[PDB]
């Protein structure tokens, strides 16, 4: 089969997922945010991308069915997108985005929005090269760190056919 495989993140290996947030984008997430994912009311989609039977990519998104008290962004919210720097240039992020778009289309949705930092240009250009559109400019005080650091954020949206 293909060297890049997909798997559903379970609970026993959930502790591995929390490790990804510590080897991708530090100072952004906590521990309760990952502990309350499988704690037995929003729909959460988890995906683990293996490269030659090795966990290399992680995707955690949340579905928002609300539309009454919201402007225009009902769809899959790409929250955690962890890809190691050593595992790039192999269409791994492309496969993750394709799986996200497939899960968005299977949930009767036609909009995918993602939040990105304002002090990062390489990741911004990488996400724009796929086919995203910037929503306005930046957001004043949106990203909250671990110690208490705050910065601006940008929104990238895409319409799914």
């Amino acid at each position: 089969r293909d060297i890049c495989t997909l798997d559903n993140v379970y609970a026993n290996n959930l502790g591995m997922l929390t490790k990804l947030a510590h080897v991708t984008v530090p100072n952004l997430y906590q521990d309760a945010f990952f502990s309350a994912l499988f704690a037995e009311k929003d729909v959460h989609f988890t995906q683990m991308a293996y490269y030659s039977e090795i966990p290399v990519g992680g995707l955690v998104a949340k579905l928002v069915p609300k539309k009454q008290n919201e402007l225009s962004l009902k769809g899959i919210q790409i929250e955690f997108l962890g890809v190691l720097p050593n595992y790039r240039h192999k269409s791994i992020g492309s496969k993750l985005l394709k799986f996200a778009e497939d899960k968005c289309s299977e949930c009767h949705q036609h909009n995918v929005f993602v939040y990105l930092p304002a002090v990062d240009d390489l990741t911004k250009q990488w996400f724009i090269a796929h086919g995203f559109e910037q929503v306005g400019e930046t957001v004043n005080n949106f990203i909250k760190g671990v110690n208490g650091d705050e910065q601006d954020a940008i929104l990238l949206k895409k319409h799914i056919s």
Partner: protein
């Protein structure tokens, strides 16, 4: 098990075979790539760390295992090797902490749990070792799983715990 594949040979050969093997491994690693071939890169790093740990080397082995963890931190064997190196260097508590942190990544394997319990028993930590072991055991008429461990006919656990008791009594 690559090092295992050369484990008995190292018990019979040394200054004649190990230098050639090290040279071949270095020549193979010098032509690899951390991005194009990540799997061969991490396996070569693990083999080099094993070979240097067998040759009574510790700083270079720690450097290699740290580079391997920074390259791919999703392998239990790396944490096991780090715990073994820290145990050989006299750091039992740090090894137990690292191995527990690595075991918390995936809670489905029993070999890693037994290794963690053994390393905690070797680290003068009995209560935490029992609390960790009391998970996959059958809990019925007891607050922990000591009765279950005694009913499954154990031996190594009792031996490792009695040694910790003797060390704590001698201290």
């Amino acid at each position: 098990a690559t090092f295992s594949n050369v484990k008995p040979l190292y018990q019979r050969r040394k200054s004649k075979v190990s230098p050639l093997l090290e040279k071949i491994v270095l020549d193979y690693l010098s032509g690899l790539d951390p991005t194009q071939d990540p799997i061969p890169f991490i396996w070569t790093n693990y083999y080099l760390s094993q070979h240097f740990l067998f040759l009574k080397d510790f700083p270079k082995a720690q450097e290699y295992i740290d580079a391997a963890l920074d390259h791919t931190p999703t392998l239990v064997e790396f944490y096991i090797l780090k715990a073994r190196i820290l145990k050989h260097l006299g750091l039992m508590d740090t090894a137990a902490g690292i191995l527990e942190e690595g075991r918390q990544l995936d809670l489905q394997d029993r070999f890693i749990n037994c290794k963690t319990v053994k390393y905690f028993l070797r680290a003068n930590n009995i209560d935490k070792a029992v609390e960790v072991a009391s998970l996959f055991t059958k809990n019925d008429d007891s607050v922990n799983g000591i009765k279950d461990l005694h009913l499954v006919e154990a031996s190594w656990f009792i031996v490792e715990q009695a040694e910790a008791y003797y060390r704590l009594y001698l201290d």
